[PDB]
A paper describes a structure:
We next asked whether the AtAGO10 PIWI loop also adopts a stabilized conformation when swapped into HsAGO2. The structure reveals that the swapped PIWI loop adopts a defined conformation, likely stabilized by multiple internal hydrogen bonds within the loop: the sidechains of E602 and N603, the N603 mainchain carbonyl and E605 sidechain, and the sidechains of E605 and S608 are within hydrogen‐bonding distances of each other. The stabilized loop reaches across the central cleft and forms two interactions with the L2 loop: The N603 sidechain is within hydrogen‐bonding distance of the mainchain amide of K355, and the mainchain carbonyl of G604 may form a hydrogen bond with the sidechain of K354. Except for the difference in the PIWI loops, the wild‐type HsAGO2 and HsAGO2 + At‐loop mutant structures are nearly identical, with an RMSD of 0.61 Å for all equivalent Cα atoms. Consistent with the hypothesis that a stabilized PIWI loop dampens seed pairing, HsAGO2 + At‐loop bound the 2–8 target with ~ 75‐fold lower affinity than wild‐type HsAGO2. Thus, consistent with in vitro measurements, the engineered HsAGO2 + At‐loop displays superior RNAi properties, with enhanced siRNA‐like targeting silencing and reduced miRNA‐like targeting in mammalian cells.
Argonaute (AGO) proteins use microRNAs (miRNAs) and small interfering RNAs (siRNAs) as guides to regulate gene expression in plants and animals. AGO proteins use small RNA guides to identify complementary sites in transcripts targeted for silencing or repression. AGO proteins create the seed region by pre‐organizing guide nucleotides g2–g7 in a helical conformation, thereby lowering the entropic cost of initiating target binding (Wang et al, 2008; Parker et al, 2009; Schirle & MacRae, 2012). Here, we show that this major functional distinction depends on a minor structural difference between plant and animal AGO proteins: a 9‐amino acid loop in the PIWI domain.
Numbering used by the authors: 23 to 120, 125 to 151, 153 to 270, 276 to 672, 674 to 820, 837 to 859
The structure:
RNA sequence: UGGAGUGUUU
């Protein structure tokens, strides 16, 4: 239950010079002093806690603190660069915030030794977190009051004009900051950042932007049920201010303000029902302009605190955690994507303006931050060859993380003779003209790809509505012999997609392939090729395999590769559960992957039923190959902070699945966490190594020195080619390894596994198993109908046994 | 839903 040490340093691949957004920190020798701060009441937010501690330090300057500049992490912890004149006992005093007052006790609580961290960085020892957290607090104290903190990032509306996304949302620009340990030194990781916030505006205007109103006067009428529930879902949980006191919106009343009532006790003591409108006429002398609109129920969901919309504004600086519309993300993408050189410059600018060496609290603790990016030597791993089949078994060589299928044919292409078309797009748009020509050009590329689709579609008729899918599909399977695949047309976003997969994947076992209307009216060879990549594996074929003799040693004895991830409800609602997914390789290529899915507790990241899921996959492996794996390689999607709560349940769960399968069956387990959500960015030092318009590092770039863990087994690997914006290099952390991998073999194996993703002829940013796991879980979300007990939910995500033996999630 | 990659006190 302890991460293994780094076994060695990789030597494979050609070196290139890199720079990381990790800035060396010169940490003094001292023993800083940590004091505990309890604040009555303990409920107010960190922001208030900071101003409480701020004015306290000025109020008790000559009394307690002196010429010092302590740092405060919000919450209950305060630090100083030399002892405070309180010794050890618990002092108590009073804080008056510009009227309310707060009580604060300050008692010394042990002493954080910085010289001890030095030793842990110089090989000896693990690393103590209490000293890393102490440093983090020091570096964050000033930004915490100077800007709006969000996790480990800092944001502000310091102009930048306004970047709207619509629907009462806008993009703010800030920066991430974190203190990270490495070999022989501490690192300050700095990166530019951007996230969506709610526009601070009158709620009235917020209602307009959410339902597309040029102005509120558009609706002289009350809201319909759809508008009210759409508006409710948008404002639920947001904070508002009165026209200042702020509340939290827990609901939107059904009745308008002119009729919504609350109990009001009269001077006599008898309670009478009073309307929100009347109360605001009598108590505040304000005649509501929009009495036909609903009210905002705030505070406790029973205090009957109702506020008219026209006397409320959205509070400034609320991160939008709800899901963004497709159009909103595109605008965010286009507005935040920067090429590697641009982003590198933006980070340099951040360093200049930040001016850490002149921050009073930072220099109070004697810390220096090198203004230049750390120099790092990376290694560009050689890519694997991709063995194709057909006539001449062409061998593709990835170039810059990319290859094509030209003059190449699938390894095991499938001959598809009988098939159908189910067009839900209006004929007058997708006329019979488009259908045929689409099929014709779709047979040409199919022939060229080694997946010949002979003959014409045995059946091709129109349809409309999500209710016509179940019966039509029933008619399809029972009526056509050897029906392999059903192509479906869709006119943009439609709930018919869910029913098509929910039916094709679960209630029957017929592979389906959906395609948007526009991709049929205007065919394209490369779009058709990518489409053929998917159906070939959906029907059991093998698009390609790694060049077998190019594989690393691990493939000697039988081995199974697993990927695991948990998808959560897209946004805030606890009536829908989280979905766990685990996939496993079923051959030695490795190409085919069998999937397992589990519905579990809402927003639970731990895979609760992992033991059973691994059991399933081990059995399916044995049936597919007649072998029992001697090694289990487990690629687990990144985790918050919870490594050991993940390493404890999930590692034991995997081991429990081997020994409940068969006493004395003990395969070596390798547990690797794969993380994309970090702010480590690598840049080419030499202009000549830049790749593409975005000038990113090349696919295969690997780093396991200088910026990696001082003792444990972790490394970065940018397996993919950056198309738009700056590449995110995947981080891999080996939590457990019974198999005693070398650095090189593990990095190469990880890299090669990124070349087995069947949906594209490119190296992907994470190994295929971890990627498939995400596709499975996401596919389980479409198994969810409205047009909910645990057993009923878990039954919907159960896949038809015929489709199970394929990669239906592709 | 061709695909990858780029940002996340009423
Ligand atoms: Mg995940």
């Amino acid at each position: 239950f302890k991460p293994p040490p780094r076994p060695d340093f990789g030597t494979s691949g050609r070196t290139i010079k890199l720079q990381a957004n990790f800035f060396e920190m010169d940490i003094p020798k001292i023993d800083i002093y940590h004091y505990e701060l309890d604040i009555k009441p303990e409920k107010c937010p960190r922001r208030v806690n900071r101003e409480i501690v701020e004015h306290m330090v000025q109020h008790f300057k000559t009394q307690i603190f002196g010429d010092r500049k302590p740092v405060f992490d919000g919450r209950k912890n305060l630090y100083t660069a030399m002892p405070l004149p309180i010794g050890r006992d618990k002092v108590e005093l009073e804080v008056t915030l510009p009227d309310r007052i707060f009580k604060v006790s300050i008692k010394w609580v042990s002493c954080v030794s910085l010289q001890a961290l030095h030793d842990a960085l110089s090989g000896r020892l693990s690393v103590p977190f209490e000293t890393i957290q102490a440093l983090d607090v020091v570096m964050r104290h000033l930004p915490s009051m100077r800007y709006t903190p969000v996790g480990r990032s800092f944001f502000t509306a310091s102009e930048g004009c306004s970047n709207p996304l619509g629907g009462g949302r806008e993009v703010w620009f800030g920066f991430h900051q974190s203190v990270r340990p490495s070999l022989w030194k501490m690192m300050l990781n700095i990166d530019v950042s951007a996230t969506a916030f709610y526009k601070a505006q009158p709620v009235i205007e917020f209602v307009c932007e959410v339902l597309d109103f040029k102005s509120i006067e558009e609706q002289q009428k009350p809201l319909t049920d759809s508008q009210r529930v759409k508006f409710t879902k948008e404002i639920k949980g947001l904070k508002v201010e009165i026209t200042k006191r702020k509340y939290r919106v827990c609901n939107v009343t059904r009745r308008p303000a002119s009729h919504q009532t609350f109990p009001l006790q009269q001077e006599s003591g008898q309670t009478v029902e009073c309307t929100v409108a009347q109360y605001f006429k009598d108590r505040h002398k304000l005649v509501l302009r929009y009495p036909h609109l609903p009210c905002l129920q705030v505070g406790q969901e029973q205090k009957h605190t109702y506020l008219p919309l026209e006397v409320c504004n959205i509070v400034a600086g609320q991160r939008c955690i709800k899901k963004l519309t497709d159009n909103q993300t595109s605008t965010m993408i286009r507005a935040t994507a920067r090429s590697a050189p641009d982003r590198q410059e933006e980070i340099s600018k951040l360093m200049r303006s930040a001016d850490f060496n002149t921050d009073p609290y930072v220099r109070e603790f004697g810390i220096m931050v090198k203004d230049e990016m750390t120099d790092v030597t990376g290694r560009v791993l050689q890519p694997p060859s991709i063995l194709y089949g057909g006539r001449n078994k062409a061998i593709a060589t990835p170039v810059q993380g990319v290859w094509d299928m030209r003059n190449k044919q699938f390894h095991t292409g499938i001959e598809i003779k009988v098939w159908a078309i189910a067009c839900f797009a209006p004929q007058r748009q997708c006329t019979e003209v488009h259908l045929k020509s689409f099929t014709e050009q779709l047979r040409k590329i199919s022939r060229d790809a080694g997946m010949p689709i002979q003959g014409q579609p045995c059946f091709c008729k129109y349809a409309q509505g999500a209710d016509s899918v179940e019966p039509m599909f029933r008619h399809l399977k029972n009526t056509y012999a050897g029906l392999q695949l059903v192509v479906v047309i869709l006119p943009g976003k439609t709930p018919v997609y869910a029913e098509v997969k929910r039916v094709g994947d679960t209630v029957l076992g017929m592979a389906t392939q959906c395609v948007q209307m526009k991709n049929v009216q205007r065919t394209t060879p490369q779009t058709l090729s990518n489409l053929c990549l998917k159906i070939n594996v959906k029907l059991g074929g093998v698009n390609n395999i790694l060049l077998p003799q190019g594989r690393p040693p691990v493939f000697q004895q039988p081995v199974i590769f697993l990927g695991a991830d948990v998808t959560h409800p897209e946004n805030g609602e606890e009536s829908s559960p989280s979905i766990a997914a685990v996939v496993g390789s079923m051959d030695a290529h490795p190409n085919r992957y069998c999937a397992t899915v589990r519905v579990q507790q809402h927003r639970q990241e731990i895979i609760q039923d992992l033991a059973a899921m691994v059991r399933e996959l081990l059995i399916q492996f044995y049936k597919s190959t007649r072998f029992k794996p001697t090694r289990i390689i487990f690629y687990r999607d990144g985790v918050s902070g919870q490594f050991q709560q993940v390493l404890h349940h999930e590692l034991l769960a995997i081991r429990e699945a081997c020994i409940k399968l068969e006493k004395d069956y003990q395969p070596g387990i390798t547990f690797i966490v794969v993380q994309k959500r970090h702010h480590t960015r690598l840049f080419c030092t030499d202009k000549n190594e830049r790749v593409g318009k975005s000038g990113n590092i090349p696919a295969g770039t690997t780093v396991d020195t200088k910026i990696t863990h001082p003792t444990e087994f972790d490394f970065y690997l940018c397996s993919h080619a950056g198309i738009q914006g700056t590449s995110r290099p995947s981080h891999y952390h080996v939590l457990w390894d019974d198999n005693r991998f070398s650095s090189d073999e593990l990095q190469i194996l990880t890299y090669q596994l990124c070349h087995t993703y069947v949906r594209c002829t490119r190296s992907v940013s994470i190994p295929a198993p971890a990627y498939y796991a995400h596709l499975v879980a996401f596919r389980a979300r479409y198994h969810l109908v409205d047009k909910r007990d645990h057993q009923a939910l878990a039954k919907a995500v159960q896949v038809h046994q015929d489709t199970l033996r394929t990669m239906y999630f592709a």
